[PDB]
From Swiss-Prot, chain B:
Job description of the protein: Catalyzes the aldol-type condensation of 2-oxoglutarate with acetyl-CoA to yield homocitrate, the first step of the alpha-aminoadipate (AAA) lysine biosynthesis pathway.
Recorded consequence of changing E158 to A/Q: Abolishes the catalytic activity
Enzyme class: transferase
UniProt KW Ligase keyword: no
Species the sequence originates in: Schizosaccharomyces pombe (strain 972 / ATCC 24843)
Protein name in the entry: Homocitrate synthase, mitochondrial
Reactions listed under catalytic activity: acetyl-CoA + 2-oxoglutarate + H2O = (2R)-homocitrate + CoA + H(+)
Amino acid sequence: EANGTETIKPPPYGPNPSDFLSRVNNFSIIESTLREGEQFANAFFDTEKKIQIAKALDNFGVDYIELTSPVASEQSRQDCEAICKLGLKCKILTHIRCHMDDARVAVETGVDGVDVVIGTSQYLRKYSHDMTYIIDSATEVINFVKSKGIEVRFSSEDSFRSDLVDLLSLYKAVDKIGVNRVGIADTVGCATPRQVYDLIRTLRGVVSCDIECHFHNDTGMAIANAYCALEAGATHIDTSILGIGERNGITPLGALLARMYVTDREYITHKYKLNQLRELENLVADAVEVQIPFNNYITGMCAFTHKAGIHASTYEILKPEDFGMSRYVHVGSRLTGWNAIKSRAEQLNLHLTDAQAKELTVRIKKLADVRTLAMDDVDRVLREYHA
Amino acid sequence: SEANGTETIKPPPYGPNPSDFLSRVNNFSIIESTLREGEQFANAFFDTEKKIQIAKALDNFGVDYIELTSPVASEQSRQDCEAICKLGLKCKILTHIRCHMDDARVAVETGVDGVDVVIGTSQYLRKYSHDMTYIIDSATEVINFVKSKGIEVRFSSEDSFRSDLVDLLSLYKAVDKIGVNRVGIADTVGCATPRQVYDLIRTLRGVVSCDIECHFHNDTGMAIANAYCALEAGATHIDTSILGIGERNGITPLGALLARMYVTDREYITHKYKLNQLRELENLVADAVEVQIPFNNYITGMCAFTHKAGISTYEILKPEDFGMSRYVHVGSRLTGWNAIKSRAEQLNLHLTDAQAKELTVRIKKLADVRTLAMDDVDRVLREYHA
Ligand SMILES: O=C(O)CCC(=O)C(=O)O
Ligand SMILES: O=C(O)CCC(=O)C(=O)O
Ligand SMILES: [Co+2]
Ligand SMILES: [Co+2]
Ligand code: NA
Ligand code: NA
C-alpha cells in the first residue's frame, strides 16, 4: 500500500561532447622516481642504482623518465649523461630553472627534453597601445632549446594557489611562442578533484599544446586528481614509485595503474608489464629502505585478501593474474611463521625450494624473537625472491 | 618584452553558487567503522577488551557515531554490542543488519541507538498497478518496528555504483516515503570515481529528503576523494576506519579524511576532534591487527612531515595541530639513536636518559637481524606517548 512510489526513469544516451576530450585510455606516464623521488627523506641514489631504476622503468613500459637537474650538482650532470647513453626506448627528461646556463648544460648531457620552470621576475603584465609577456631573456632559452631539437615543457610552481589571471595569461603567451607541453603542479597537496577538473578543462581551451600534471598526496587526492586531469584532457601524468617524493610524495605509479586498469583493462595490460610491478617497488623499497605498506595498492599484503567466515569473490575488480599473482587469499585465521610465508609466497608465485623455505622460516623466527611480527614482515622476508 | 606576448585573459560580480549551499564539507558526521568494517581486515581478531578500548578512544576522539558488527553474526558479537551500549559513550552506537525481523529484534535488545539496514534483491519489486516500485510488506515491517522502538534507521543497498539507477533511486524514494533517518550509498567494489560520486550524490540529494551516508572502498585510491565529493554534493555522513582497515585494502581512512577536511576548514576540524590523539588511536589499532604504520601514512607516517634539505610556504598541514612539533629537515640517513632522537622530538616524547638506552639497544638488536626500515623507528617508539 503506502510503501511504494512511481518508478523514477529518465526521459538516446550516447557520449557527451566532453567525453571526446578525455585521455583516460590514451595518456603518457612521466616517471619521476629519479627526480621527485630524490626528494624523498631517505633517497640517496648512487649512479648504479639510478641506472637500474632507469632500465627497469624503460622495460616496464613508461614513455618518459624525468631526472634531477644536471646543474644541481656534478654527480647529477654525470648521471644524466650516463643515463642518456644507455639507449633506453623511453624519452629522457630533465628539470631545469629557466636560464641560459641550465639549458646549455641540459642539452649537452643529451636529454630528449627539458621541463622548464619559470620565476615571477621572468614574466610581466603591462598595458601597451592589458598585455602579458615572457621577458626577452627567458624567451631566448625556449628558442635555444627548440633550435637544438629538444622538447620543451613549461611550468609554473604552486599552480592552484596562483592568480588565475596570471597563470592562464602566461600559459597562453607560452603557447604563442610554441612549446610541446605546459605543466600544472599541486606542490602543496591542496587541490580537490572537481577543482582540478575545471582548471584542466579551461587550460585545454586556452592552449593547443600538450598538458602535464603533477600532484602531491598530502590530503589523499594525488591519484584522484590525476584521474580527473585525464578526464579533462591532460595528456601526461608524473608518478613516482610508491609515490616517494617530498613529504608523503606524489601520484604513485602502481596506484595510478590500478585506477587506469579498472577504467580500461586491455589498454593498461598491454602497454605496461604489470607483473613487473612488485619487482619495481621492491628495488626502490630496498634503496630508500622502507617497507611496502600493508595496504599498498595491488602489491601490499592485504590488497588481494578476503575475510573468510564470521566476518564475510565477484567483488574483485582487480584480477590477480593480470599483476603476476595467483589468487585472492581467503583469510580465516592468524597465520604464523612458516604458514604465513607459504601463503604469501604461493599468492606471489614464488616457487620456493626446500632449503629456501628453511632459510626463510628460520629468519622469520629470529625476527619474532626481537618483537611481534607485523604482516609486512612477511613481505620483507620475501623481498629477495622472484616469480 | 617583444612580439611574442598575448592579451591578458580575464573573466567578465562573483560570489557563491547555489550548489555551494548544499555542500556539507564543514558540517558532517563521521561514522567510525573500525569495529564493523575493520573486523573484515585480514588481520583483525578483536576480543571484547580491545573492542571496548577502541570504542572509548573513538568516543573521546570526538566521532559522532561508531558502527558495530551485527549482533546476529555470532554470540560473542551479540555480547560485545550489549557491552559497548552499556559503557555510556557520548557518541551514538549503530549496528549493521540484514533486513529481517529477527535481526532487528536482537539489535533493539542489545541497546543500539540505530540500525544500519541493508536490503536484498528479493525484498523489493517493480510492478504496474492501475510502473511502481514497492518495498515488500514484510520488509517494511522491520523499518516500522525499529522506528516504534525509538531507534534510528538507515537503509541501504550493496554495490551501489554497479546497480541499475532505475531500481536504486526508485527504492530510495520508496524508502523515503516510508520515512527513515538516512539512506546509504556504498562503493563495495572500489570502482567509483569522484565526479561519478558527485553526480550520483547530487541526484540522490534531489530524490530523498533524509540524510545520506556514504561508504567507499579504496581499491583504486579513490576512497578519500570520493568522500570529499560526496560531502560537496550533500552527503551528511561518511564511514571511515582507522588506517582504513577493512576488506582488501580497506575504506576511507579516518586520519586521511581528517587531513583533507582540515585543509578545507582548520577551525571546524581542530575544534571538533582531538587531533593530537590520532597517533595513539592509530597505534592502538596497529598493535591489535599487527601491522606497521605506512611510512607515507597521512599526518602520522614517518615521512608526512619531512622536507628534503640539500642538492613554511609549502606546509598545508601544521604539525602543532596534530600534536607534533615541526617538519624535520632531512639531509642525511640518520642511523641508530640519531634517528630515534629526531622522530621522538618531532612526536613530542620527552624520553628519559634510561628510555633512550632501552630504545638504542633495541634498534641495534633489530638491525643485527636485517637492514633497517624507516618504519622501524616508529615501531620501536610505538609504546611511548607525548
Ligand atoms: O616542475 C614541476 O611541475 C614539478 C616541481 C614539483 O615537484 C612540485 O611543484 O611539487
Ligand atoms: O552497509 C553498507 O552499506 C556497507 C557494507 C560494505 O562494507 C560494503 O558495501 O563494502
Ligand atoms: Co613535487
Ligand atoms: Co565495505
Ligand atoms: Na584549445
Ligand atoms: Na530533496
